[PDB]
Design an enzyme around this catalytic site. Structure first.
Site, PDB file in Angstrom:
ATOM      1  N   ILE A   1       0.742  -1.274   0.000  1.00 17.73           N
ATOM      2  CA  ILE A   1       0.000   0.000   0.000  1.00 17.73           C
ATOM      3  C   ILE A   1       0.781   1.341   0.000  1.00 17.73           C
ATOM      4  O   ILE A   1       0.379   2.274  -0.699  1.00 17.73           O
ATOM      5  CB  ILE A   1      -1.160   0.027   1.052  1.00 17.73           C
TER       6      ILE A   1
ATOM      7  N   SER B   1       3.923   4.360  -0.153  1.00 12.57           N
ATOM      8  CA  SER B   1       4.974   4.831  -1.075  1.00 12.57           C
ATOM      9  C   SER B   1       5.917   5.905  -0.493  1.00 12.57           C
ATOM     10  O   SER B   1       5.883   6.200   0.714  1.00 12.57           O
ATOM     11  CB  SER B   1       4.357   5.359  -2.380  1.00 12.57           C
TER      12      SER B   1
ATOM     13  N   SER C   1       9.741   7.621   0.365  1.00 10.10           N
ATOM     14  CA  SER C   1      10.705   7.049   1.317  1.00 10.10           C
ATOM     15  C   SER C   1       9.971   6.827   2.652  1.00 10.10           C
ATOM     16  O   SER C   1       8.806   6.407   2.632  1.00 10.10           O
ATOM     17  CB  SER C   1      11.983   7.899   1.458  1.00 10.10           C
TER      18      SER C   1
ATOM     19  N   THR D   1       7.828   1.477   3.037  1.00  9.94           N
ATOM     20  CA  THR D   1       6.692   0.896   2.313  1.00  9.94           C
ATOM     21  C   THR D   1       5.805   0.171   3.327  1.00  9.94           C
ATOM     22  O   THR D   1       6.307  -0.536   4.213  1.00  9.94           O
ATOM     23  CB  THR D   1       7.157  -0.120   1.218  1.00  9.94           C
ATOM     24  N   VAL D   2       4.491   0.349   3.195  1.00  2.45           N
ATOM     25  CA  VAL D   2       3.539  -0.261   4.120  1.00  2.45           C
ATOM     26  C   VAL D   2       2.764  -1.389   3.437  1.00  2.45           C
ATOM     27  O   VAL D   2       2.091  -1.176   2.422  1.00  2.45           O
ATOM     28  CB  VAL D   2       2.537   0.767   4.713  1.00  2.45           C
TER      29      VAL D   2
ATOM     30  N   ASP E   1       3.322  16.039  11.978  1.00  3.46           N
ATOM     31  CA  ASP E   1       2.793  15.695  10.675  1.00  3.46           C
ATOM     32  C   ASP E   1       1.344  15.298  10.776  1.00  3.46           C
ATOM     33  O   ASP E   1       0.851  14.439  10.029  1.00  3.46           O
ATOM     34  CB  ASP E   1       3.600  14.573  10.039  1.00  3.46           C
TER      35      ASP E   1
HETATM   36  C1  LIG Z   1       2.132   3.303  16.647  1.00  2.00           C
HETATM   37  C2  LIG Z   1       2.368   3.949  15.281  1.00  2.00           C
HETATM   38  C3  LIG Z   1       3.838   3.894  14.857  1.00  2.00           C
HETATM   39  S1  LIG Z   1       4.218   5.076  13.497  1.00  2.00           S
HETATM   40  O1  LIG Z   1       5.415   4.639  12.769  1.00  2.00           O
HETATM   41  O2  LIG Z   1       4.128   6.425  14.076  1.00  2.00           O
HETATM   42  N1  LIG Z   1       2.930   4.808  12.394  1.00  2.00           N
HETATM   43  C4  LIG Z   1       2.781   3.704  11.664  1.00  2.00           C
HETATM   44  C5  LIG Z   1       3.729   2.655  11.763  1.00  2.00           C
HETATM   45  C6  LIG Z   1       3.592   1.477  11.002  1.00  2.00           C
HETATM   46  C7  LIG Z   1       2.481   1.368  10.143  1.00  2.00           C
HETATM   47  F1  LIG Z   1       2.294   0.272   9.396  1.00  2.00           F
HETATM   48  C8  LIG Z   1       1.531   2.399  10.039  1.00  2.00           C
HETATM   49  N2  LIG Z   1       0.427   2.271   9.189  1.00  2.00           N
HETATM   50  C9  LIG Z   1       0.213   2.852   8.008  1.00  2.00           C
HETATM   51  O3  LIG Z   1       0.980   3.620   7.424  1.00  2.00           O
HETATM   52  C10 LIG Z   1      -1.024   2.437   7.457  1.00  2.00           C
HETATM   53  C11 LIG Z   1      -1.474   2.741   6.142  1.00  2.00           C
HETATM   54  S2  LIG Z   1      -3.038   2.039   5.853  1.00  2.00           S
HETATM   55  C12 LIG Z   1      -3.065   1.359   7.461  1.00  2.00           C
HETATM   56  C13 LIG Z   1      -4.147   0.582   7.958  1.00  2.00           C
HETATM   57  N3  LIG Z   1      -5.254   0.299   7.225  1.00  2.00           N
HETATM   58  N4  LIG Z   1      -4.059   0.102   9.212  1.00  2.00           N
HETATM   59  C14 LIG Z   1      -2.936   0.416   9.894  1.00  2.00           C
HETATM   60  N5  LIG Z   1      -1.862   1.142   9.512  1.00  2.00           N
HETATM   61  C15 LIG Z   1      -1.931   1.625   8.258  1.00  2.00           C
HETATM   62  C16 LIG Z   1       1.679   3.567  10.793  1.00  2.00           C
HETATM   63  F2  LIG Z   1       0.734   4.515  10.650  1.00  2.00           F
END
Ligand SMILES: CCCS(=O)(=O)Nc1ccc(F)c(NC(=O)c2csc3c(N)ncnc23)c1F
Ligand SMILES: CCCS(=O)(=O)Nc1ccc(F)c(NC(=O)c2csc3c(N)ncnc23)c1F
Lengths: 266, 276
Positions: A16, A18, A20, A23-24, A129
Site C-alpha cells: 500500500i 509509497s 521514502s 513501504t507499508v 505531521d
Molecule cells: C504506533 C504507530 C507507529 S508510526 O510509525 O508512528 N505509524 C505507523 C507505523 C507502522 C504502520 F504500518 C503504520 N500504518 C500505516 O501507514 C497504514 C497505512 S493504511 C493502514 C491501515 N489500514 N491500518 C494500519 N496502519 C496503516 C503507521 F501509521
C-alpha cells in the site's frame, strides 16, 4: 519485554505505502496487521541502534485513539508492526470518496483526534505531521492517529497545507512545538467543517508556502457549512493563530470541543 | 516508559464492579477509562512490589483482541486502568439482554476470542479465568479479552475473593481444575476447555447444566466425569465442524484438547464455508 518479532513469524501480503520513510504492507501476525518496512537495506549500527531508540517512543503509547504499536522487525528488514484498520483514512473519506458525514459525527472525529493528541502531548510526543491522511477511521467509527514516530530516523514536502507558519518558513532548528501540532489540528478542523483542502484557488505551491509563512495567506474560515456551530469557527481561528503562543494547548482545545458538542443535538 | 499514573489525574465515576477483590469504575483519564481499584486496604511493602510485577505481565500485551492496558495507580489506592469499552460483555449479551446474534457474527465472536487467546498464550500468559463475562464486545463487534491480570496477587492475599471467583466460574472449569488434585492444574488446555464452554454458550445461547440447580453436585459430577455439556442443544444451523471443534475442545482428558493455533485454523476454515 522486548518486542523483537523473530523472522518467519510475520507473513507479508498486499502492498500500500509509497515514497521514502518506508513501504507499508498489510500483513498477518496473530491476525491481520500493518507492516511498515523502512526498506533502508542492511544497517549497520548505530543506524540499527537509532531504530531501537525510535521504537522506545512508540511503546510509550497506549490509547484508543493512537494506532496500536504491536512490534518491530529487524531481521527480514527494519520494520514496525501495528494493528490493521478496517475502513479508510479521513483524507480518503473527505477528499477521495467524499463521504458526507453528519455534523454530529464530524464533531466527534475532531473530538477523538484532539483526545489522541492531548495524550501524545501529555506523553511528550510531537507528531510533526498531523494531517487527515494520518488520521484513520477504524470501522469508520474510531480514530487512530498514526505516523507520529520515526522523527529522528528521518534526521539521520507535500503536507505543506498543515504546516504552521513557523514550520512552513523553514526558519530555525526546531519549529516543532505542541503548538505546531495544534495548528495542524486546526487545518484538519477546517477540513472537516468544509470537507475541503485549504487554498484550493491557488495553483502555485511556492506562493502558498511564501504567503503562509509570512501570514498573508491563511485558511478561509467562512467556507464552514451553516449547520456548523459558531463556537467551532472560534476554535479553528484559535488553533490557526499565526503567532504560536496564541494557540491553545490540547486539554483546553478538548474542553471546547466537548462543551460545544453537548449543545448541538439538544 | 514506566506506566504509573500520578495521583488524582484519574476521575472515578460510576460504580460497576461488585466484587470483594476491589471495584471496577467507569473513569476518565485522557478520555473514558475503566479503573479497577484493588481496595485491599493499604499495603504493605512488599505486596506493593509484587503488585508492580503483575503490571509487568500486563505490559506484555499489545493486541486488538486483548483489553488494552492503559496504566496503573498506587497513589490513592492500588489500581489498574484500561480502555473503557462501549457495549457489553458476552455474558451480558447472551444471558442478560438475550441478544440473538447472526450465525456469521457468532462464529466471528468465536474467532476473535480464539485469536486473542492464541496471542495471550503465545506470550506465555495463561488466562486461568476465561468466561463470557471476561469477553467484552467493544462497539458490539470487537472482542476484548480481559480479567486475566493479577494472577499471583489474587492467588495470595487474605480474602473471600479467593473463594468467590472459584465458585464464580465452576461452569467453565475443566475437570483437571475442578478436582484440586495438585498445586498447578491450570494449563493452555484448561483455557482451551473454558473456551470450549464459551463455544457452547455461543451456539446454545445458554450456560451449560441449566437444569441442575444444585451447584455442589455439578462440581462433584464434572470432576468425576459423570457430567459434560449436552451438545445436542447446538442450534440446528450450527456448522457441524463447529460442533466437532466444540467436542474436541471440551475433551475430559486434557491432552486430547487441541491448542489455539490449530483451533484458529478450524474456525477460519468453517467461516469460509457459509456466506459464499
Ligand atoms: C504506533 C504507530 C507507529 S508510526 O510509525 O508512528 N505509524 C505507523 C507505523 C507502522 C504502520 F504500518 C503504520 N500504518 C500505516 O501507514 C497504514 C497505512 S493504511 C493502514 C491501515 N489500514 N491500518 C494500519 N496502519 C496503516 C503507521 F501509521
Ligand atoms: C488486560 C487488562 C488488565 S486485567 O486485570 O486482565 N482486566 C481488567 C483490569 C482492569 C479493569 F478495569 C477491567 N475491566 C473491567 O472489569 C470492566 C468491566 S466493564 C468494562 C468495560 N466496559 N470496558 C473495560 N473494562 C471493563 C479489566 F477487565
Amino acid at each position: 519485554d522486548d518486542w523483537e518479532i523473530p523472522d518467519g513469524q510475520i507473513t507479508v501480503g498486499q502492498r500500500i505505502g509509497s515514497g521514502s520513510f518506508g513501504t507499508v504492507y498489510k500483513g498477518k501476525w496473530h491476525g491481520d496487521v500493518a507492516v511498515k518496512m523502512l526498506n533502508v537495506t542492511a544497517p549497520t549500527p548505530q543506524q540499527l541502534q537509532a531504530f531501537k531508540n525510535e521504537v522506545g517512543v512508540l511503546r510509550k503509547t497506549r490509547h484508543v485513539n493512537i494506532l496500536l504499536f504491536m512490534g518491530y522487525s529487524t531481521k527480514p528488514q527494519l520494520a514496525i508492526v501495528t494493528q490493521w484498520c478496517e475502513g479508510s483514512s479521513l483524507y480518503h473519506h473527505l477528499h477521495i470518496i467524499e463521504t458526507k458525514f453528519e455534523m454530529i459525527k464530524l464533531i466527534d472525529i475532531a473530538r477523538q483526534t484532539a483526545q489522541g493528541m492531548d495524550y501524545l502531548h501529555a506523553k511528550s510526543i510531537i507528531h510533526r505531521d498531523l494531517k487527515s491522511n494520518n488520521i484513520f477511521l477504524h470501522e469508520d467509527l474510531t480514530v487512530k492517529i498514526g505516523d507520529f514516530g520515526l522523527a529522528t530516523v528521518k534526521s539521520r514536502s507535500g503536507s505543506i497545507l498543515w504546516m504552521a507558519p513557523e514550520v512552513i518558513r523553514m526558519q530555525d532548528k526546531n519549529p516543532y512545538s505542541f503548538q505546531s501540532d495544534v495548528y495542524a489540528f486546526g487545518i484538519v478542523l477546517y477540513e472537516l467543517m468544509t470537507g475541503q483542502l485549504p487554498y484550493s484557488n491557488i495553483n502555485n505551491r511556492d506562493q502558498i508556502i511564501f504567503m503562509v509563512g509570512r501570514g498573508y495567506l491563511s485558511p478561509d474560515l467562512s467556507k464552514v457549512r451553516s449547520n456548523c456551530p459558531k463556537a467551532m469557527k472560534r476554535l479553528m481561528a484559535e488553533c490557526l493563530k499565526k503567532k504560536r503562543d496564541e494557540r491553545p494547548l490540547f486539554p483546553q482545545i478538548l474542553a471546547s470541543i466537548e462543551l460545544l458538542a453537548r449543545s448541538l443535538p439538544k
